[PDB]
Each structure stands twice: as C-alpha cells, then as structure tokens.
Amino acid sequence: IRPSFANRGTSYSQYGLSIRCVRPDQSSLTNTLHYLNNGVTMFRFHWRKNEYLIPSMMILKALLETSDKEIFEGIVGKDLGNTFLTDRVELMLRAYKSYGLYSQTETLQYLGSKFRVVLGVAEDLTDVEVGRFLLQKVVLVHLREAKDKFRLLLFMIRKLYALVAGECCADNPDSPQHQEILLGGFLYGQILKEKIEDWLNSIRAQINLDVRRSAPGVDFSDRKYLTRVFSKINNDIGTKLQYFLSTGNLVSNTGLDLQQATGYTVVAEKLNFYRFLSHFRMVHRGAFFAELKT
Amino acid sequence: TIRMHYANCNSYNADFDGDEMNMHFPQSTNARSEAQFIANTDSQYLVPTSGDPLRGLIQDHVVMGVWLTCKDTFYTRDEYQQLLFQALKPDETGMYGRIKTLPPAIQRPGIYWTGKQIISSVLLNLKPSDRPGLNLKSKAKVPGKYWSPDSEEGSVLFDDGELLCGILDKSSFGASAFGLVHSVHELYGPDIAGRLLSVLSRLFTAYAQMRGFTCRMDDLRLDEQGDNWRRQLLENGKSFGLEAASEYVGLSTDSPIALLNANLEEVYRDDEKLQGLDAAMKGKMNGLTSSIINKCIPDGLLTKFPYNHMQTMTVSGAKGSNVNVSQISCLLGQQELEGRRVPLMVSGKSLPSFVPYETSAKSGGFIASRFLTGIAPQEYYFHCMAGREGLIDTGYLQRCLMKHLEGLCVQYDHTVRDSDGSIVQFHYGEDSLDVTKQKHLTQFEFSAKNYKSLIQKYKVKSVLSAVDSETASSYAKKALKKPYKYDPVLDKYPPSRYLGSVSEKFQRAVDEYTQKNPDKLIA
Amino acid sequence: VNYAARSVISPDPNIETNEIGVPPVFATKLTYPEPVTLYNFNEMRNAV
Amino acid sequence: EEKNIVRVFRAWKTAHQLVHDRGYGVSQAELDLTLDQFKAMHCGMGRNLDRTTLSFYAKPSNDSNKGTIYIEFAKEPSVGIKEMRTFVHTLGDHNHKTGILIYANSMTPSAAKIIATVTGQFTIETFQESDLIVNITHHELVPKHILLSPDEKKELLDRYKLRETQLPRIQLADPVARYLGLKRGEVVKIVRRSETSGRYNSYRICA
Amino acid sequence: DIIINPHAFPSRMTIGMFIESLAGKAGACHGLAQDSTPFIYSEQQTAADYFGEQLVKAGYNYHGNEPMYSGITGQEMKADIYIGVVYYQRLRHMVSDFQVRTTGPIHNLTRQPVKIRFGEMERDAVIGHGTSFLMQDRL
Amino acid sequence: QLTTLLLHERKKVVRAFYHAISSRKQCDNCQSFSPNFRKEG
Amino acid sequence: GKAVAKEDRTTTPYMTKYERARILGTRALQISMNAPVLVDLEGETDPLQIAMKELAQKKIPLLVRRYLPDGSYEDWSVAELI
Amino acid sequence: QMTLNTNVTLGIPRLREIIMTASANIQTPTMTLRLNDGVSDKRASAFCKEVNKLVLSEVVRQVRVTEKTYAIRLDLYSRDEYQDEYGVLQEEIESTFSNRFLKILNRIIKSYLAKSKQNCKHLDFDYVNGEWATVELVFPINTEKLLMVSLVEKACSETVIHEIPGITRCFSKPDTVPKVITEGVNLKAIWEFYNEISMNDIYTNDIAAILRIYGVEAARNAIVHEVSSVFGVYGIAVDPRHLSLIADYMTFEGGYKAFNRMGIEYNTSPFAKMSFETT
Amino acid sequence: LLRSTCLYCHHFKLSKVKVHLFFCRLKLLDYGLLNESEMVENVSL
Amino acid sequence: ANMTPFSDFNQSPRNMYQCQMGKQTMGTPGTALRYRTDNKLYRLQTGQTPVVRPKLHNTYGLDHYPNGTNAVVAVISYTGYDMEDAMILNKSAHERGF
Ligand SMILES: [Zn+2]
C-alpha cells in the first residue's frame, strides 16, 4: 500500500503486489502487479533501466495454452459466485478480450513483434521464440516450468484481489519480517556476471561492425579472425571490478534491482577492535531512505 | 587551553566537552571602550526575551549552598576567617583595604559563627560606599516541608544585608529572578552583581574543599519498608491491564478468553480503536505509577532529605528532577513512544515473548523494574524502542525577521521608526523597556521595602534639576478621570523629560498597591 | 578577520565571572596598536 | 422559516448605530430598538411586510461639514442599474450629501462604474447586509477608532516632524475603514487597549 | 586516580556505573573477574547486595562508601565518599583539536584573509548590542 | 508650496502598466497590426 | 537643515547608554594621541581610564550632536547631560 | 530552544506559517464561540449538530445492488438511533437524497463511462418508515459492467445534507464556561446564530480572514495573541514588547505581509535587497 | 518592450490616453501624493 | 553492545552512546603494527582487562585487544573544576603512565 502508485498511472490505484524473484545465481529482478481502478491488473516490470507494462491477462494466456474458463475457475474457483471477485474477474477478462487475440501462438507472436527491439535477442532467427524468450527471461525468473509460473501467477492475482477487498492486511516492506540481507560475495558475483555479459555484447557488436563496414575480414571459420577481434576490443574487466571496489559507483547497464547506485563499499578502519567488528556485522537500508525524513 | 568561569556556560550554551570558541580582539580604542562599557559580560545578566536572568551558579555551587546555609552548620573562628578570605580574595580584584566581619552568632561555651553569617558577611564586604543594606523576602527552591513539618527555612528573609532566615539554592542565586543575586543586580548595579556571583562561586568551592559532597550508593536503595510497599502496590496492580482492556472493549473481567480475544482481534486491525485502547490503559497505568511514586520516594527511601546526597541534587535543583529519582528508585512506568504505546506486529503480540492479544500491562510497554534493581529483557526492548525514538527525534527564520528589521531603531523623539524614516510604533511597545530594565516595576513591595538605596541609585538631586516634574504628574490624574478627551500622558507629554508621564496601567497598579496593601507605606 | 584566535575552552572557578584566562601563547600572539604618551612611556619601553 | 425579519432588524443596530461612530446624532431610542419594536414600527398584513419603508437619515452633531447623511435599504436583490441611479437624485434634492445602501445579493459590477462617477462631490457608500449585520466595533479585538480634523492632523504632523506618507496605512477595503466613512487622506487615531502597559493612542491614515 | 563529579549521575541514570564501581572494588580485592552479563541479577536478590556481601567480606563499607580525608585541609570530610575501580577507555576525538591569526596572506581578488569567520550571525549579535563601531571595526 | 509606501505604490503601478502595454495587439493610434516577434531561450 | 535652538530642546537629558560609551571611547583616543588631560592623574597608565576619571568629574569637552529623524540636530554639552 | 511535542499544529511549523509565509489556508483553522445564558446543553448539542456538516454516507448502512434492469438499494439506520447522533429529519433526507444523490450518482457513472469509451428510471424512498432507498436504473446492454458497489460508496460519501461552506467538526470542550470549538472558519455563518455570543469568539489565526472582515487592528491583536500562545505551549516566555513590535511592523502597510519575496521587494535600500536572496 | 512596440505606429499598442494616464500617475507619485495619484481616474469621457 | 557491564541498568540512550563511543576508543588496533601501511593508527601503551566484564569478553577473544585501564574513580565534587561533565586526573597517576 504505497500512495506513489496513485499518481503514477492515474487509472491505477495504491494497492499493488510486489515480488522480487531471483534466479539460481542470485541475480534477482522485480515485477509488480498494479491493480488499476478499472479492474484489470497490470504486470509492471523493469528491463534496461526502463519500466514496462503489459496486461496480466495477456501474459496469463501467453504462458500456457489456456482457455478463459480455466483462468476464471483458477483465480476464483471457490464458493461459486463470490460477488466481488466474480465481477472483477469478469471485467478483467472482457477488458482483455477488447483488443487481443485468442490462442497462445497469436499472443506470443504479437508480444515478440512488440518487444523484439529492447531484448538483446538474435536479430534473424525467429519471432515467436522471442515471445518465449520474454516468458522465460522476465516474467517470473525464479520458476522454471511454464505451467508453474502460470499457477503462481493465478495465486498472486488472487492475493491482489483479496488485498483490494480488505480481506488481507498490507505486508510492511519497512520491517525485518519482509527483509533479507545481501552479502558481499553475491553482489560481487552479480557484478562479475554483468561485466561478462557486457563483454560478450561488446565483442558481438565488434563482430557486427567488422562485418558491416564492407567486408574487411569476414571468416567465421578462421581462428585468426577471432584472435583479431579479441585483440581489438577491451579485454580487461579486472579493472572494472577493481574500480567498483575502489570507489563504489556500481556502473552497470542494468541496476540488478538495486535502488541506489553509490556507496557500496566501506573502508575497514582498524582504528580499534570494536570498530573492525562493527564494520563486519552491520547492515544498511541505503540513503534513498535517508533523504526522506520520516 | 583558555579558561573561563562556569557562569558563562549557561549563556554561551556550551558544555566544555570539545566545542571551541572564536576569541577576537578589538584593535582600535573606540572598539575596546564600547566593548568594555556596552557589551561587557557582567552587563549581560538579563536575556532579552524575558526578564528572567541567565547567568548564575550551577550544580556544585548550589548543592553546597543548600548544605552551607542550612541551620545545623557551625564554624570555629579559623574556618570562618579562612572561608571568608577564600571567598573575597581582594588583592586579585582590588578596591578594598581591610576585610571586616560580624560578631559571632553564639558566644559561649565556645564561639561559633554560623553559615548564614558567612553569607551575610560576604554581602557586608561587597556593600558599596554608602548604600543601605539589602533587605528582601523571597521563596526558596527547597520546599519548606522537606526540612520539617512547619519548618521555618522555606523562604529567605534578610534585612539590612544579613541573612536572617532561609537557605540559598537554585532560586536564590542562579537562573532564577527575584532572588539574592538579581536583587543585588538591581540595587548595587551590574558590576557588583558580577563580583558577588564570583564571590559566591569561590566561597562554595572552598566550602566543598573543606567538606566535600558525593552521590554514593545507599542514596538510592529503598529501605525494606519502602520496597515492600512498592511490592505490595505492584502485587495489587498485577492485573490493571486486563481490567482496563476489558472495560474498554465492553466485556467484564470474568469473560471467556476466546470472546475477548475475538473482540481484541477486531479492535487493532483499525487505528482509532487503538487510540482509545491505549489512552484508557495508559490512564490506568499512570494512575498506578503516580500512586507508588507518591507513596515511596518521599518517605520510603533510605536516607532523608539533608543527608541523602541525591535528594539534595534533585530537590535543590542542581541537576535532575523528581522523575529521575522516581526511575532510579521506584519504577519506570509506561513507555510512551511517539504518543500511544508499543507498536503491535502483524500477529497482535507485542513481542515474540508474549502470547497473541496479550492484555497484561507488562506487554503494553509498562515496565515495573527500576534502574537500581535492573530491567528484564522484554522490558529492556521497549525501553530501547522509546530511547532510540527520542534520538531520532532530537536556520532560515533568522534571515526573514532580520532583513526587514535591520534598522528598526528607537529614534530620539522616542518613536520607533524604520531607518528609511517611516514610523512603526510611537512609544516603542508601550515604552518602558524590553525586559532588561522593566523587571522590578511589578515588585512594588521590594522597591518600597528599602527605598533608601534606590533614591541614591537614581541620583535624585541631579535628575530633579533639569526635567519637568509638576506638569505631567498633574495631568496624569486628569487622565485617570475615566471619561475621554484626555489622552494617555505619554502621547501628550514625552516620557524622557516630563517626570510625571508614565503608562496608564503602571499608575493603576501603583495606586492599587498604595491603597490596597500599604503595610510598608505609613498611612 | 584579522586578530582573532580560536581554541577549545575548559572550565576554571578561580578567575572571575568576567575574566577569561588566556595562556601566555595567546598573550604573545595577539597584539594591538597603542600610541605612546608621557605616562605610559615606561610600560611601552619595558614592553619593547 | 421566517428568520429574514430579524436579519433586517439587526441591519439597523448596525446602521442606526453607524452614526456616532461618526460624529452624527441619533435619538437614543433608535439605538435601543427591541426585537418586536421594529415589528410594531414597520408592520402590515404580513408577517413579511418590512420593505418600501426602510429609509431614514441623520444630521451632524458638529453643526457643519457639508452636509448630512441618509440611509436607505434597497431590498430588491442585485440592485443593478435601474435601482441605483434613480436613488441618487433623491440624495441630490434633499441636499443629502452622502448616502448609504444595502444589497443582498451580488451587486452587479456593471452597475458600479457608471454610478461611482456620478457621485463626484457626493459619495454613495457602500454596505451590504449579511456581511455587516452586527457592529464589529463592539468587540474585544477591535479598538475604538477616532477621526481627526485637519487642525488635529496638522498638530500630529508637527509634533513628529512627519510627512503624510510616513505614518501607518489603512486600506479603504478595511471593514472599519468604510465603517467610519473614511476618505482617502484622513488620519484616524486608534485607542489601543494593549495590556502590557496602559492603553495608548496610535495613528493611521488611508491611501 | 580520577575524580568524577556526582552531579553527572542524576539526569543520566548511569546507575550501572555505581554498580560497576562496586563490582570493581570488590573484584580487585579478592581477585575475581566479576561477572557482569546483562539480565542475571533479578529483583529478589539485587546485584548491589551481592557485591556488597563481597565487599563486607573484604572489609570495606557495604554501600561502597569510604572515609576520606581532604588534602588541602587535612581533617576528614564530614560525609563518606564513593571510591571504586571503573574501566576508563581513553577516547581519541581530540586528534583534531586551535588557530590564532594575527596577520597573514590576503586574497587574490577581494584582499580578504585567506581561508576566522565573523558575520551573517555575528553581525546580528553586534548590531544587537548596539555596537556600530565594533561592527565597523571587526568587519 | 522616498518612503516605502511611495515605492510600494510605484512598483505596483508599473507592474500594472506592463500588464497593460503587453495586452494590446492592435494599435489605437495607427489601428494597424504591427508584426509580432517570437523569441528563444 | 536646521540647528535647533538652545531654548527648546526635546531630546532626553540622560546620557544614554550609548553616548557614554562613545564619549569615553573618543576621549580615550584623543588622550592617546597626546591631547591635554583636564584632570590630575594619580599614576594611571591606560589612555582610557584617564577618560573615566575625566567623566567622573564632568571635566570633558566634546559636545554631542543628536540627529533627530527630521534631519535636525541638537547640540548637547557633555557637562549639560545628566 | 525546543521543537518536540509531548488536532492542531504546534511548534516551528505554526510559527513558520504565521510569521514567514503569512498564508491563508492554515492547516487547522479553528474558531471558538462562547455560549450564552439562554442556552441549555440540549440546545448546545442541537446547535452543534446544526452548524455541523454530515455526509449521506454517515447515515447509510450496507448498500446492496442487484444486477440484471439495474437496481440499487441503500439501507438507512433506524430513525431513532439515526436521530440520536443527528437531528436531520426524514423529509430532509428524502429531498436531498433524491435530488443531489441522483445528480452525483449519474455524474460519476458518466465519468466512468466516458473513461471506458476510449437516465434515472425509477426511485422509491421508504415514504413512511425511512429505512431503505431504492433507485432502479436502466442502461444499454452494450455498456460494460459497472462496479456499482464502489460507485455508490463514492456517491454516498461525496454528497452532503447540510454543509456551511468550509466548516466541519463542531465540538464541545470543558472553567464552567461552555464553549464550542469548531474546525473551519466561516464567520459569515456564525453571525447568524444567536445561541452564542457574537463578540467573544477566539480564532486560531487564519489572520487572512480576521484581517479581511474585522479590520487591520484586529489582525494586529490577533497575531500578537497567536504568537504569544504559540510560545506559551512551551515554557518559554517572550514578553509582549517583542511580539508587539513584530506585529505592528507586519500590519504596517495596512494588510499583513509575509517576510519573504513580497516583503523583501519593498525596501528602499537597494543593497539589502541585492543582498539577502537573489543578487 | 519590443512586444508592446508598434512598428507601423512607432508608439505603444496602447491608447495614448492610457499611456498619458500612467504618465500622470508616475508624475504625481514623484512628490509623494498617494490618494492624489489615485484621484486622477475620477474622470469620465 | 553486549560488552557493557550491567548494560541493563542504564537508561538505554546511555547504552546507545556507549556503543557508538566505544567504537572510537584509542585502543590496541591489533598486534602486528610493524607491518601496517595505514595512514593513522592509534595505540594504547598501558591497557588492561576490565575487572568487571561479561563472560563474552572472554569468549569473543577480546583479551588480545585491550581498550582501557582501571581507574580508581572517586565520585566527589571537591576540586571544583569538574562541572559540565569534565573531570580531573591525579597528576602522579598521570606521570606514572596513565
Ligand atoms: Zn501603428
């Protein structure tokens, strides 16, 4: 229950459901459910520093080969005909029926043709697999099996609708009930994976530009070509990590779901023993809250 | 490290803990002349906001004051002379030739000067050339009942400059008006109030070196009857929490646990119903707390007022308050964090130690243990909550009211104008003065009490010469004729030269005193 | 500003309510001009 | 229900009072009007029966000052253009110098500029009911305001070596300003009862 | 070794320090390492009474007091005084202590003393005291 | 045969003047329409 | 401008808390610059406290000009003030 | 000196509003009216409910809406318990319910329908018992479903029976001096009631209002008393001379001036003006 | 000031009587006449 | 925070200040100082183990890093210099190596 939601999407409302889902490599990103005044639910998420908003019925149908009776009897299959939930789900189903298409393939193709630009996906291969690439890489990353992402999405939308009707209290994000700690080495691994992914994208852009010029050297079978290209680009990522440690300004193309991008490292002043320990134990919430005096 | 005296610690708002101070030097001689006469420290005895003085002695001096002026004290000749000379120390200050004393209060079988005689002696050595002694009557800080039932000390009375009855404490000399030092500032001028403040400082320090004063352990411990009284009151109020909660929600004390639990669960999902519940239960707990405090701290604890070395520092006003000995000796009471009380987590239990919807006040942040004996974990957590709340609780409005009020000076025709020439007030705020020189006008008993020093302070024979006396005084009575068509005397006649012209309410008050309680004024 | 020292303070009860103790270091390091006349000539000659 | 009848009664002890308070003179009975006194004076078949007869006047007690005053109640709401200019020649022919009016509600602004010019040496002034219905001057937070003659204004400007533009001001929109009948340029003397020391006299002007 | 002031304990509630001084003078005597974990000592038998048993076994006063003679006069203090063995850890905040400016360099542009601060609040004080000449001097 | 109030009135009157002169698009003396001018930051 | 006559003077006969400081300051400066001392010294050295000794006996020159807000001014001899 | 408290704004925000911005629309504009002799506690509470404003949501019970036609039925509390905390009559509800409630309901339905684009067919009040209210509506079928529960809650929560414009929450607080403390400020209303004396009425500053309809000197004494009471809640004393001077400078020009760009832009010295904010 | 210019008119876009009104105002405010500054407008043609 | 003897007797703001101030003692920053390239180290020549201690002051191996000494404190207002929280330090108790 955060009021900044309200003036965000004016058809929107303060009620939302947030989930920070994390892959096996501890590389989480967020994707929240906005409950909009009209009745439908938006599936907000983040990619490349940019918000992105696709309706939840869209990806619900795009995820599994589903028919609408299944969505309904999954969200509110209970106590047949509970007033509030029943009319809200009806309104949602029809509001999606408005413009979209019927099957899973059509939805995936539309989704790909919409989102092929921002995904770093292969330019030439195909179009529906890009929709599958979204529904693998962004939607709910902690889960592997599609049907299970579908089940958890139904449960989550049911929790949102229960929260709207006042049958569920608002969990408090500023309390250790709903908090965990990020260690050092896990952040180190995230930044190392980000630098490696940038390195791959960089040698990929170098190969594309080499091919693009006219054709100075294009031998994708010759190992000599790969030695040439590796020698071209900056091959030193040790200094990137060493800079993150020397300064703290986490300079990455994607924030890895981190609010603040400065102040990550403290210098272990061994001035006194208690000072050293107290360095090792402490935690912090980030100055993004310090700037708000409350 | 530069050294300054304690008196200024209250003025500079300093703590001598590491904060440092710019120290300038006015080069030219005009600047040092004006610093010496206008803005010198001994002339800064009155803050500008209210009349209440800000300089004056602090913790140690005032506790040793309660212990020196007390009437069970006695000195032989040696201690009297020595302590007096430590107080005066003429040579470093100057202006005086030989130190003069009093006769002893008692003379046989052994000669003994008493403490009040030492205070009177200091006052006698600092009297100017020809100003009759000080005489004064004023309530003191240490209440009269602490010494005895129908005790006499209570309130200092001293005539012609000799401390006749009463003891000096934070109200007498210090950050409290209408005491000894403020009345010396009024009668004998500022630079004598400064000398007197210094002399009291050194006198009380020297007495400390003779006697010494310490806050030992047994000052805190409750005598067995006291702490068993506290134990009985706590066993009695074992269940005030449940009574107040059940009365609030509507049920009786003998209700089934399940129904009370259901109603409580319905209560603090909301927020207003919490306001009501915490208000009721807080009223109950504070009734209990005030009860056991009122029964314990005056009489329960081990040593009585004079000897208890924390009862002195507390009720004399040096450092601390009555709530402090309450907490160190009797109980802590409700832990009020930002108003109501402890925040209830999702499951309705105040802390993971307590069962859900727990009613007993120990879960409401009321903690019964005292600092002397030790607070338990569940209590210590709420105490950390309240304290850290305080710590997260603990300059542009000085460039708004100052840019526009730069000049705003009181021109010579006595009409406070802005410097561009335009009027803002006639007779600046109903003139007499900002607090500095207007404190004692309401003290008609004091001015009329002695009256022989005030005529010499005003220098009547030089003032009555060149200022007008009959005209405004005559027209004042006609202005006191209730019907209109006679303006206030200040408007017709300026108050600087026409020595009858004074504000209306001042005339009304001086006349109501002269007619009402003239017990000093003969007929 | 010129001629303005700055230091940590510490308390002393022996001096006065007016006075401020300055170490001889501030005695030597803060000076102010003074014309020399007939009757303070001894003070100033001795000072120089 | 029929509470409108006490409103217009209370608009008299705010107007029949708004005389001295100016220097004029009124019989002490038109200040002591009881509730039913107004009804018995101005009555009819109703029980509404108040209007068409709400018009009185007053002459100065200074015996000069060119000239007198006349109060009238324009009961027709939003007096407008055909009810204001016709009620000017009456003040002109009675040799009435200055007059008063009421309106409830919303005096039409189009009927405010073409009449405010016809006044010239006279001044239509100014009030409306339902905004000044009980004397504001009868109050704790409003001191007794007094006017001043050019002799007593010259005395002021002399004892203080002032210019007529260095004093405090009072806007003409101030309630008491239009109450006393102030003109732009007259010095009021206010009798502050500020209880810190006595009650003193400050001065103000209008501009 | 260190004189602390009694007026500092009220309004501060460091009654823990009184207990710690008791425990220090008790432990140093016999040679114990007085256990002082939070939350052992209950309301039945207080910690103060335990360390008091300790001390009265050692021989000193049970409330911790001790009869002291003053040095500057020689005859005993009327009231006994409280001596214990506290643990004083010296701080280090004094590392940045002082700067006296008689005369020195001036500014490039405005010919000011190069970077003590007197103004914009000091000016309030000086023109408050009514010290035109002091303001015009120091500024 | 300067004061704040004088300046407080001058500044208001000049503000009114500059609200006025910027209002008219047609000339009252020439009756024509002078060519406008558009600015930039 | 006008120099208000001696017959009618409307300012306060008291040596205001400020005129005393500045009179003493300027007299101290004057005496510091080898001016005549109008009163017998008893051995005091500071070129200021001599001015205090002068003012205690009212033997000091330097009439003061009090500037009223009109622009006019009064001329008060320091013997004349209270 | 102090800022931490131990409902109205107290502390440096209050002073900041009264003496820095000189704002109208203070956060807690309250008035305080003294009762008279001729009034009893029954008349006290009657006048209190009279000048108080209530919302039709505050008398309605749960509101059920059946779907199909299109039908809404409001439950209204029993006239007895409804007249204990009130004293608006049944006919008043009838009239204002019908007219303004239909107006509000249709307005918000049109709002949501126009938002989705991208009439009141029957009404039956309980003309005898007054414990329910039926509105039968008809709509074209092409229109999508309507959240009638939320829309009707918004309507009943937005519509008012008797409101004096800009006042609400008249309350009674205990010196044996019965008074009425009201939130909001409409002097224009309080002139009208003769249960309470129209002279002795305290005002939380709203000094814009009292300066506007009680004079300039009224504003002066009001602001003096206001800053006195603001510094009075703390144990700090500021004698009336400082307050008198600050006030009588603030109400100099004739109105009441903030100490900001407004007041900075009027001084005659072009160096202070250059100095303090924007050279 | 350019925006208010009349290039063909070579004067202000205003009516010359309004500009003359404001000129009389700023003349009469020169010597400190406030109500006299405002009285200029009690004329109707 | 746990290493504050009788930490449940003090007004908890005092324990808060004591934690935030014992993190800033001039105490022994280790034992290998000859091999440290830090800018500013502080070391205490004469440290000891407290005579009043929590058992965890032994468990957490604090014995290898003492912070302060044991002062024979007399609660007394005698010198007069010790107001506003200041204190004295017995001269010979200083010139013998406090
Ligand atoms: Zn033209």
Short mmCIF file of N, CA, C and O in Angstrom, two decimals, chain B residues 36 102 129 149 154 236 267 389 392:
data_model
loop_
_atom_site.label_atom_id
_atom_site.label_comp_id
_atom_site.label_asym_id
_atom_site.label_seq_id
_atom_site.Cartn_x
_atom_site.Cartn_y
_atom_site.Cartn_z
N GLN B 36 33.97 47.37 26.55
CA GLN B 36 34.09 47.36 28.00
C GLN B 36 32.85 47.93 28.67
O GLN B 36 32.45 47.46 29.74
N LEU B 102 31.51 40.06 61.17
CA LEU B 102 30.43 40.21 62.12
C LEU B 102 30.84 39.69 63.48
O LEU B 102 31.87 39.03 63.62
N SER B 129 30.10 52.07 48.97
CA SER B 129 30.45 53.10 49.94
C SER B 129 29.28 53.44 50.85
O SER B 129 29.31 53.19 52.06
N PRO B 149 8.08 19.39 59.49
CA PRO B 149 6.70 19.90 59.49
C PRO B 149 6.68 21.28 60.11
O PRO B 149 7.23 21.50 61.20
N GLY B 154 12.48 27.43 54.34
CA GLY B 154 11.41 27.74 53.42
C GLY B 154 11.72 28.85 52.45
O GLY B 154 11.93 28.64 51.25
N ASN B 236 -0.81 -5.64 44.00
CA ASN B 236 -2.18 -5.16 43.91
C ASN B 236 -2.55 -4.83 42.47
O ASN B 236 -3.61 -5.22 41.98
N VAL B 267 -10.32 -5.24 17.23
CA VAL B 267 -10.02 -3.87 17.64
C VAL B 267 -8.82 -3.33 16.88
O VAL B 267 -8.94 -2.36 16.12
N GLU B 389 13.70 6.15 19.77
CA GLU B 389 12.71 7.10 19.29
C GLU B 389 13.10 8.52 19.63
O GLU B 389 13.07 9.42 18.78
N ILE B 392 16.08 9.66 17.40
CA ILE B 392 15.66 10.09 16.06
C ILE B 392 14.75 11.30 16.11
O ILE B 392 14.49 11.91 15.07
#
